[PDB]
Short mmCIF file of C-alpha atoms and ligand atoms in Angstrom, two decimals:
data_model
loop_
_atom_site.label_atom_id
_atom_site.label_comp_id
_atom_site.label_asym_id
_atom_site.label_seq_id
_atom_site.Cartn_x
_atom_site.Cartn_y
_atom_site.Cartn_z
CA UNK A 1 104.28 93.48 108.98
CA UNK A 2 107.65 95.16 107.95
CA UNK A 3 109.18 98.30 108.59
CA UNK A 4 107.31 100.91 109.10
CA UNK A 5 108.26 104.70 108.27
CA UNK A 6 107.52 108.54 107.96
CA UNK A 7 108.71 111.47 105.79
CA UNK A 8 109.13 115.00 106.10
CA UNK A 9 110.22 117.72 103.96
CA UNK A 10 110.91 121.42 103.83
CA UNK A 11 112.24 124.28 101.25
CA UNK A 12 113.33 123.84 97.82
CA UNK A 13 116.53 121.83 98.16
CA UNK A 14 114.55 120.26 99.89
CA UNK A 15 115.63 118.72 103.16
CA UNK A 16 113.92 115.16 103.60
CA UNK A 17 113.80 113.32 106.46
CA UNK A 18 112.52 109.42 106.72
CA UNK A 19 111.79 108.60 110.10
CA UNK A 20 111.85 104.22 109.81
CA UNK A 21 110.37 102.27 112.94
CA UNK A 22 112.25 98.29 112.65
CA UNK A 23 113.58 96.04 115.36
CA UNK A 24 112.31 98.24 118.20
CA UNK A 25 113.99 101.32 117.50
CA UNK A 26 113.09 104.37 114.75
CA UNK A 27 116.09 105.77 113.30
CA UNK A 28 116.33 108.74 111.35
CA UNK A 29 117.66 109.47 107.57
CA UNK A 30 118.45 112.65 106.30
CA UNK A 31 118.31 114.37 103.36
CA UNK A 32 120.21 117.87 102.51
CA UNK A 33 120.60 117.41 98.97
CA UNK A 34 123.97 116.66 98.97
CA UNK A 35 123.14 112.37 99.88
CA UNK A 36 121.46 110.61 102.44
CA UNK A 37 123.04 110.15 106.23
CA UNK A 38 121.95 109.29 109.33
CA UNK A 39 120.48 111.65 111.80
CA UNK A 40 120.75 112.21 115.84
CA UNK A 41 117.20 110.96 116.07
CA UNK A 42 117.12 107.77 117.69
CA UNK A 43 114.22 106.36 120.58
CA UNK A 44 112.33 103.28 121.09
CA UNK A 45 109.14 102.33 119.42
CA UNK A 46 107.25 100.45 116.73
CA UNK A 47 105.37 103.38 114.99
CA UNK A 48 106.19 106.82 113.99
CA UNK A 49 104.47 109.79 112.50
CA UNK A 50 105.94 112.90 111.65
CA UNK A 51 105.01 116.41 111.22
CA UNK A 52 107.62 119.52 110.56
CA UNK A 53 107.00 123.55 110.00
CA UNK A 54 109.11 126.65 109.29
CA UNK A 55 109.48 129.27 111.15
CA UNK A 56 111.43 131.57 108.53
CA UNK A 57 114.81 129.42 107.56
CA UNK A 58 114.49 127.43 111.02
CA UNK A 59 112.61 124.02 110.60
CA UNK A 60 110.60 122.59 113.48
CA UNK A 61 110.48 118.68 113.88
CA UNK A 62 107.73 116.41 115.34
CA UNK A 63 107.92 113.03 115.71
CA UNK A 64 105.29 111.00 117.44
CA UNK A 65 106.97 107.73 118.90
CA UNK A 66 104.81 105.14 119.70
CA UNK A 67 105.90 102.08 122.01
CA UNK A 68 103.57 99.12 122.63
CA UNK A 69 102.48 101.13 125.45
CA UNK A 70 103.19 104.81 124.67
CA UNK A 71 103.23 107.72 122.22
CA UNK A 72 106.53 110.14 122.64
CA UNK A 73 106.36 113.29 121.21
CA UNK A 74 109.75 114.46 120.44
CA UNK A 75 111.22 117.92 119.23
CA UNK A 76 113.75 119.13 117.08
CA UNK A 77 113.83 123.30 117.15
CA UNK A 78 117.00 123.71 115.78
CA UNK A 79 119.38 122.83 119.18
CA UNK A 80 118.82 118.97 120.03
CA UNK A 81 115.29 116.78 120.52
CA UNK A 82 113.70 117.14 123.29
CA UNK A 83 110.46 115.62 125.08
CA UNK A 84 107.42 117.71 124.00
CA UNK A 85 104.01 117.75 126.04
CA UNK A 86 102.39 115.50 124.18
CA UNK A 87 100.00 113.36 125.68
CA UNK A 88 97.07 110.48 124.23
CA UNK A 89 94.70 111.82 126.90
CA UNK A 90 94.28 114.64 129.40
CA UNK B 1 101.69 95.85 116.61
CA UNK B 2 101.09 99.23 118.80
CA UNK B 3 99.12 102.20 118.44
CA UNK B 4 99.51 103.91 114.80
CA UNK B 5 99.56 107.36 114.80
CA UNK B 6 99.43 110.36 111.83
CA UNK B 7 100.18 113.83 111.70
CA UNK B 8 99.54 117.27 110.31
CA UNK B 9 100.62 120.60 111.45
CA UNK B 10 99.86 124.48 110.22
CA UNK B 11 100.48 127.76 110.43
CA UNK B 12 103.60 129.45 112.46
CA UNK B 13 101.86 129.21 116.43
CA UNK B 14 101.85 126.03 114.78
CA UNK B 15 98.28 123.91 115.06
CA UNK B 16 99.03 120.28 115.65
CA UNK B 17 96.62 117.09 114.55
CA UNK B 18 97.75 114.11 116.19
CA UNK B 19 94.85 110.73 114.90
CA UNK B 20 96.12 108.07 116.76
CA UNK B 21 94.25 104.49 115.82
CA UNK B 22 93.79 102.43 118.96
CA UNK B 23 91.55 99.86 120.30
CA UNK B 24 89.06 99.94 117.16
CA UNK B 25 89.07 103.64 117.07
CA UNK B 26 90.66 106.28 115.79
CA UNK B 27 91.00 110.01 117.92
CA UNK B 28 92.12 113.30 117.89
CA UNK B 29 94.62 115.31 119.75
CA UNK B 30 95.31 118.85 119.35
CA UNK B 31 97.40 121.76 119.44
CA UNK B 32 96.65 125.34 119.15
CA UNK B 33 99.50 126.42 121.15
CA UNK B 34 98.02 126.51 124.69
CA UNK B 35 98.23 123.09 125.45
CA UNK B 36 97.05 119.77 123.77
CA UNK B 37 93.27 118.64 124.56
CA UNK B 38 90.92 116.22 122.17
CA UNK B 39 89.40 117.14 119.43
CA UNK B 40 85.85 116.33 117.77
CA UNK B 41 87.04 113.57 115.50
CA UNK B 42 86.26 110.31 116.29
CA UNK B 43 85.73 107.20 114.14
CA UNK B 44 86.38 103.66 113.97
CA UNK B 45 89.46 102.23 112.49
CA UNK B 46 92.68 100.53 112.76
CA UNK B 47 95.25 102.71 110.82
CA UNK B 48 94.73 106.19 109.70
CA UNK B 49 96.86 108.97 107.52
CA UNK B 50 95.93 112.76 107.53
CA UNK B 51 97.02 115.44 105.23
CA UNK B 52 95.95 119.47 105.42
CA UNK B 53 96.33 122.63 103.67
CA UNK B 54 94.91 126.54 104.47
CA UNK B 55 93.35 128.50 102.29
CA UNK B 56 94.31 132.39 103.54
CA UNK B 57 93.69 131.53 107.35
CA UNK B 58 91.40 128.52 107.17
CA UNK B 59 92.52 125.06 107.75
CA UNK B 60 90.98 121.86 105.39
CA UNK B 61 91.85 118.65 106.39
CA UNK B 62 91.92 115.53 105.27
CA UNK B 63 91.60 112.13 107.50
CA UNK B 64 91.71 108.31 105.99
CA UNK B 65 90.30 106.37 107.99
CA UNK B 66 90.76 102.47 107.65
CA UNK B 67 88.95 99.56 109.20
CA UNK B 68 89.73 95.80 108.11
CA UNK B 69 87.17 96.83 105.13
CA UNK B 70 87.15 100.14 104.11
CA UNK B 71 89.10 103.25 103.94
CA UNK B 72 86.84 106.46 104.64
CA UNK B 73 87.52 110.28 103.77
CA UNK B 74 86.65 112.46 106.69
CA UNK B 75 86.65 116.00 106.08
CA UNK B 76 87.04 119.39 108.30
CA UNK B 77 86.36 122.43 106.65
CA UNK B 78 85.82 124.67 109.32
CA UNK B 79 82.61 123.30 110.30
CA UNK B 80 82.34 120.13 111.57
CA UNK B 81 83.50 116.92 110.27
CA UNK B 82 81.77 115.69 106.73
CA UNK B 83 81.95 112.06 104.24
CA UNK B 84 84.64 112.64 101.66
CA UNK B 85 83.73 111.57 97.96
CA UNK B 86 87.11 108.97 98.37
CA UNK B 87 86.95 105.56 96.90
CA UNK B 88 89.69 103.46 96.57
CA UNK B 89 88.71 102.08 93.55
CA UNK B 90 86.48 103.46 90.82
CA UNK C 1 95.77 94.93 110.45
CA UNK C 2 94.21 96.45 107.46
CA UNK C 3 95.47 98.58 104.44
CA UNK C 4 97.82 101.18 105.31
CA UNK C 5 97.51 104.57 103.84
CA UNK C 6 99.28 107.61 103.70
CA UNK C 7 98.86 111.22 101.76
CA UNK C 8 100.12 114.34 101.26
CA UNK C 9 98.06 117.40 99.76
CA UNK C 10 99.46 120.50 97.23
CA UNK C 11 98.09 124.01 96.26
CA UNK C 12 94.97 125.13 96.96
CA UNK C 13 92.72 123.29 94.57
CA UNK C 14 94.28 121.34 96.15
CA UNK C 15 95.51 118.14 94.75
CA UNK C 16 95.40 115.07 96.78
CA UNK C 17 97.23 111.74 96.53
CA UNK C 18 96.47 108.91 98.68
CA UNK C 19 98.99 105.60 98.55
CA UNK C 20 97.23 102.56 100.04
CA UNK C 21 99.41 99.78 100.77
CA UNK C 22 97.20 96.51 100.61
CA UNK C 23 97.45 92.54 99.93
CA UNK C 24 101.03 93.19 98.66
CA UNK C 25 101.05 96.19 96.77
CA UNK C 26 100.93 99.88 96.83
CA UNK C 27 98.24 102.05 94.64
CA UNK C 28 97.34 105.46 94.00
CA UNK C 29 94.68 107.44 93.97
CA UNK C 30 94.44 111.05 92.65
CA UNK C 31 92.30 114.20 93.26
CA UNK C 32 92.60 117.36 91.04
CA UNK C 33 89.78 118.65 92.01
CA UNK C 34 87.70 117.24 89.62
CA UNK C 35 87.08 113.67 91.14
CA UNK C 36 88.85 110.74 92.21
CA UNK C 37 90.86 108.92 89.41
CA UNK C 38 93.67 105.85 89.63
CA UNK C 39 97.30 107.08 89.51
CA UNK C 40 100.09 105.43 87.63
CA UNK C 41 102.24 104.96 91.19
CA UNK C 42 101.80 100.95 91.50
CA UNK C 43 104.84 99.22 93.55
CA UNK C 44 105.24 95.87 95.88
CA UNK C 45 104.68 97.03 99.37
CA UNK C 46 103.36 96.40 103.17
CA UNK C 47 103.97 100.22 104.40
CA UNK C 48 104.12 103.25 102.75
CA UNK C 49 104.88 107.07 103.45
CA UNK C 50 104.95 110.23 101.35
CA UNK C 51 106.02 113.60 101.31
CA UNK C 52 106.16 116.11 98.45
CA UNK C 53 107.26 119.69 97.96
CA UNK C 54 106.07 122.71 95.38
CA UNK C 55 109.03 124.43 93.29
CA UNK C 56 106.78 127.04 91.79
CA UNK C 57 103.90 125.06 89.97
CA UNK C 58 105.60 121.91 89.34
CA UNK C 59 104.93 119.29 92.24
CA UNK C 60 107.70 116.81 93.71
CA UNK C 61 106.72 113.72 95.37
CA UNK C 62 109.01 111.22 97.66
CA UNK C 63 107.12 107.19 98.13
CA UNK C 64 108.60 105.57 100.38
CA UNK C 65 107.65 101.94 99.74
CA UNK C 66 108.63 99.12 102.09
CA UNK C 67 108.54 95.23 101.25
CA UNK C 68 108.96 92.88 104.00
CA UNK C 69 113.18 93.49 103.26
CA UNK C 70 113.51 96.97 101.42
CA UNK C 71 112.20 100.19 101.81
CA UNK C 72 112.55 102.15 98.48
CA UNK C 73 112.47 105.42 97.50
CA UNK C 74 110.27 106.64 94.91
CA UNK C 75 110.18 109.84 92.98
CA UNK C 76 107.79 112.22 91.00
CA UNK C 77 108.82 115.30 89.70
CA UNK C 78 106.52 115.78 86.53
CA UNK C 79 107.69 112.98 84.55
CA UNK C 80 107.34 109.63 85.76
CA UNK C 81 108.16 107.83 88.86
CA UNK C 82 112.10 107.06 89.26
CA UNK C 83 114.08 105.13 91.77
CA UNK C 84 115.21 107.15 94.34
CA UNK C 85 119.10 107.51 95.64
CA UNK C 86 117.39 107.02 99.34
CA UNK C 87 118.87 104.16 101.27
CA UNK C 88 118.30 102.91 105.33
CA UNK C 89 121.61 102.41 105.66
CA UNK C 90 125.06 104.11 104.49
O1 BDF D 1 121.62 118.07 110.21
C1 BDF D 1 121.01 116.85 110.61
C2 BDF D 1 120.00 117.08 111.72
O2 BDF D 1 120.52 117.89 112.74
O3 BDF D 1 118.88 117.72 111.11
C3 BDF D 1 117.81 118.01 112.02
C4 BDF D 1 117.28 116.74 112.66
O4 BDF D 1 116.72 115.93 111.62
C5 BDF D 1 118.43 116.01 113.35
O5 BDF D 1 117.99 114.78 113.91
C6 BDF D 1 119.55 115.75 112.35
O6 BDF D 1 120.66 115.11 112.98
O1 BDF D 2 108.34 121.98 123.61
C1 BDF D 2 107.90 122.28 122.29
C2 BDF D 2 106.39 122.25 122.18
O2 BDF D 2 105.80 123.23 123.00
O3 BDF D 2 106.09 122.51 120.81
C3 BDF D 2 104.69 122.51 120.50
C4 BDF D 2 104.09 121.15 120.80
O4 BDF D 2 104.75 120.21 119.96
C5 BDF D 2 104.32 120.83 122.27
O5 BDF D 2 103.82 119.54 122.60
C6 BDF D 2 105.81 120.89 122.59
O6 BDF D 2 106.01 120.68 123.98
O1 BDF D 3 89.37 123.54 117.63
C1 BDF D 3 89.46 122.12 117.60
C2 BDF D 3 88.96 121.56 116.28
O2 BDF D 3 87.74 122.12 115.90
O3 BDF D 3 89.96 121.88 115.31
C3 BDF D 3 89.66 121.42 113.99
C4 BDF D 3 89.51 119.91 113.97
O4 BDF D 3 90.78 119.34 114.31
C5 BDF D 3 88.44 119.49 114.97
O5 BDF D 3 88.31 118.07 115.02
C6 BDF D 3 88.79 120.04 116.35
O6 BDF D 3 87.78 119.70 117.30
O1 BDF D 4 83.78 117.34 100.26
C1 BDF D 4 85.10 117.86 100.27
C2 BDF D 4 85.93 117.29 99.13
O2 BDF D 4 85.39 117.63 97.88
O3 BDF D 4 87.23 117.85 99.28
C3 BDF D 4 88.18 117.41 98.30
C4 BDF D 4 88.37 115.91 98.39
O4 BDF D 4 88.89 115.63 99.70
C5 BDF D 4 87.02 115.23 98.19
O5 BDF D 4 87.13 113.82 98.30
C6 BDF D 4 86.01 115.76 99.20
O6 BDF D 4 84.73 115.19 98.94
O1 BDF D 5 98.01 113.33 86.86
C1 BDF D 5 98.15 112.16 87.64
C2 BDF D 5 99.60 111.92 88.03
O2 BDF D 5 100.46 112.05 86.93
O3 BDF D 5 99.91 112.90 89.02
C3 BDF D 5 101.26 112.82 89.50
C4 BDF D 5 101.53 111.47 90.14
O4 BDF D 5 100.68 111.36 91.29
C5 BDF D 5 101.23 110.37 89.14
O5 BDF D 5 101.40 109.08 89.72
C6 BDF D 5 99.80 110.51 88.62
O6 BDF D 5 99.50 109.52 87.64
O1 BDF D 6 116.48 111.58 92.06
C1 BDF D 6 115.77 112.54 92.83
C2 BDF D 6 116.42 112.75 94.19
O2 BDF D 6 117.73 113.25 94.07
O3 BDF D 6 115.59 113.68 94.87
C3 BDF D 6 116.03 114.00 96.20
C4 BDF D 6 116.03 112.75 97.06
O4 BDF D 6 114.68 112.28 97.12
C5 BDF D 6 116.94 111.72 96.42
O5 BDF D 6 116.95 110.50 97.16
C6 BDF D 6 116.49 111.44 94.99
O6 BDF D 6 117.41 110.54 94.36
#
């Protein structure tokens, strides 16, 4: 056991992001090509995946959160995450 | 220790693959864009990655699925899910 | 617990890599289309994640390799496998 994490990447610069689950939290690190910083994405949880698309120029963000007792599915389109309808089972 | 999930996304609707490993098993949620229900794959593990890629409109995917012992290649092609030549080692 | 993979995919051969994290270290193995064969990727690890990204014909891969302390970045881009800038923290 150690941290856990999750990458991402789009375009030609390209923009990177590691998603890295430690301590109870996942916290987000961002690459633009000009260095690494820390992204808005921050929720509980001890395992992440991460999937992203384009739609044009505009990049759409996944991130599966998973608790001890729940997945998350959280969005990024552009304007702030937001809780997606993701669920484990109907 | 929680649930491990992995994820794979395609197209511009998009198509989302959620495998989440739970429990002894590893399943499949999905996304075409009208709501998330299960998919066909099902097989036993405890950690699993996924990675996909279209050829003109078809999807191929990719799903490595891990018990305590052995790491399997399950692959979708369009019809139905088939044994992947992977080995770990040669 | 078991090994921990993780893959990404490129083209439409396509190529494959697959990093399996496992009793300490991280391997690699490769598909070309032409079989399964060992990569030269080997680092200490517990978890890993990958992305990569096409520029034209010449792939670019990102390892993220974490230790029980460190998760470090690892890069591909035609020519050997360099440390990456990425850091968890600023
Ligand atoms: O520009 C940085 C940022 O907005 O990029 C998109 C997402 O990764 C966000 O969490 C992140 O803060
Ligand atoms: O709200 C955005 C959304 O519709 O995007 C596609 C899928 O990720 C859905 O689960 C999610 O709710
Ligand atoms: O239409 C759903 C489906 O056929 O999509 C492709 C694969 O994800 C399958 O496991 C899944 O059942
Ligand atoms: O059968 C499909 C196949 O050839 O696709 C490419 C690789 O995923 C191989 O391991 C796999 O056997
Ligand atoms: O041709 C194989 C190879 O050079 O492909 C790119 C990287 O995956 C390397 O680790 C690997 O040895
Ligand atoms: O050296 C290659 C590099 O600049 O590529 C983009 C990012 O992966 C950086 O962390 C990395 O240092």
């Amino acid at each position: 056991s150690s941290v856990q994490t999750a990458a991402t990447s789009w375009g030609t610069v390209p923009s990177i992001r590691v998603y890295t689950a430690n301590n109870g939290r996942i916290t987000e690190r961002c690459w633009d090509g000009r260095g690494w910083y820390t992204g808005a994405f921050n929720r509980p949880g001890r395992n992440v995946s991460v999937t992203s698309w384009l739609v044009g120029s505009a990049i759409h963000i996944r991130v599966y959160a998973s608790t001890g007792t729940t997945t998350t599915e959280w969005c990024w389109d552009g304007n702030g995450w937001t809780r997606g309808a993701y669920t484990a089972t109907n």
